[PDB]
């Protein structure tokens, strides 16, 4: 068959909110809506992963990709809010240094809007100043103690401050610094990063909270 899709496919718009400092993020060419398979599943159900360096305009943030569930469609418009986040693969390669400890935790959280969000997190042992030893190893009960201080601090500053305040706490890494200065009483633990945040199903479609984000 000669299918050739030039006329039936259109150039939608995908746009950026107020906390994402750029104006536009995408101009996305998918398919024209019409009867016999209307476009709401070929629309909104798509997710949309881009870097944050152009979004908050600081190009030092070339890591930390985000997924974005499409949620608001007008004709020749879209406006996309925060759904997913994952750390960048070669930088989670670039933080693995031999002779100290990598720390993993897979925390399951839900927000008071019953938002099922996991927080996959990885921290790294700091080699102290004035240290001539080639190692900085931990003691595995010290690692366990680190990790219930980890889920202690993420449970202490989780279960509140909903997604405007939550991703407004995620992107300028307040979680990392509160893990750092909270957990350095036991063990120094620099390079605290938040590898993945997992939403699976946003339970609603509703436009009031979406325009409350916009």
């Amino acid at each position: 068959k000669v299918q050739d899709p030039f006329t039936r496919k259109d150039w939608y718009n995908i746009k950026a909110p107020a906390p994402f400092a750029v104006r536009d993020v995408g101009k996305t060419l998918v398919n024209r809506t019409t009867g016999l398979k209307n476009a709401n599943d070929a629309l909104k159900g798509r997710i949309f992963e881009v870097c944050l360096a152009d979004l908050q305009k600081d190009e030092d943030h070339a890591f930390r990709k985000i997924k974005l569930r499409v949620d608001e469609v007008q004709g020749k418009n879209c406006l996309t809010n925060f759904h997913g986040l994952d750390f960048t693969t070669d930088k989670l390669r670039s933080l693995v240094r031999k002779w100290q400890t990598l720390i993993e935790a897979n925390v399951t959280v839900t927000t008071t809007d019953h938002y099922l969000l996991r927080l996959f997190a990885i921290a790294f042992t700091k080699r102290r100043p004035n240290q001539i030893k080639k190692t900085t190893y931990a003691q595995s009960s010290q690692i366990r103690a680190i990790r219930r201080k980890m889920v202690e601090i993420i449970q202490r500053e989780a279960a509140s401050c909903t997604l405007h305040q939550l991703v407004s706490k995620l992107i300028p890494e307040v979680i990392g610094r509160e893990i750092e200065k909270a957990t350095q009483g036991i063990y120094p633990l620099q390079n605290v990063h938040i590898r993945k945040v997992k939403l699976l199903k946003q339970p609603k479609f509703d436009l009031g909270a979406l325009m409350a984000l916009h």
Binding site: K9, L29, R46, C51, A62, V70, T88
Partner: protein, 115 residues
């Protein structure tokens, strides 16, 4: 400044260039490595990446794309995590043909468990 996503999946025998939108749903133009030179031997060659690279890039500029974000991978399941001779010449010819790219980053599927 319209941007897209140009993707490369280049084994030791074949090269894939696959342009999709900024989410990854809508296939704009894909050309396999054998739709090029059509010798039955060296389908991963940098000349095949030259033909597929100039073909997909110059075609999509007639579709007016004006920028691309390239992801690069080989058969990272149980083979190598390094592409064949198609990714260097595909990024070379897509690069030197007209268009403009900002950041470059590649994603390769690490098995954290396999054997």
């Amino acid at each position: 400044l319209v941007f897209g996503v140009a993707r490369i999946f280049a084994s030791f025998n074949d090269t894939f260039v696959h342009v999709t939108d900024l989410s990854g749903r809508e296939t704009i133009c894909r050309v396999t490595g054998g739709m090029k030179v059509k010798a039955d031997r060296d389908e991963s060659s940098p000349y095949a990446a030259m033909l597929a690279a100039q073909d997909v890039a110059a075609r999509c500029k007639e579709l007016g794309i004006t920028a691309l974000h390239i992801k690069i991978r080989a058969t990272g399941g149980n083979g190598t995590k390094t592409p064949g001779p198609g990714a260097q010449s595909a990024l070379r010819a897509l690069a030197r043909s007209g268009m403009k790219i900002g950041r470059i980053e590649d994603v390769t599927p690490t098995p954290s468990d396999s054997t």
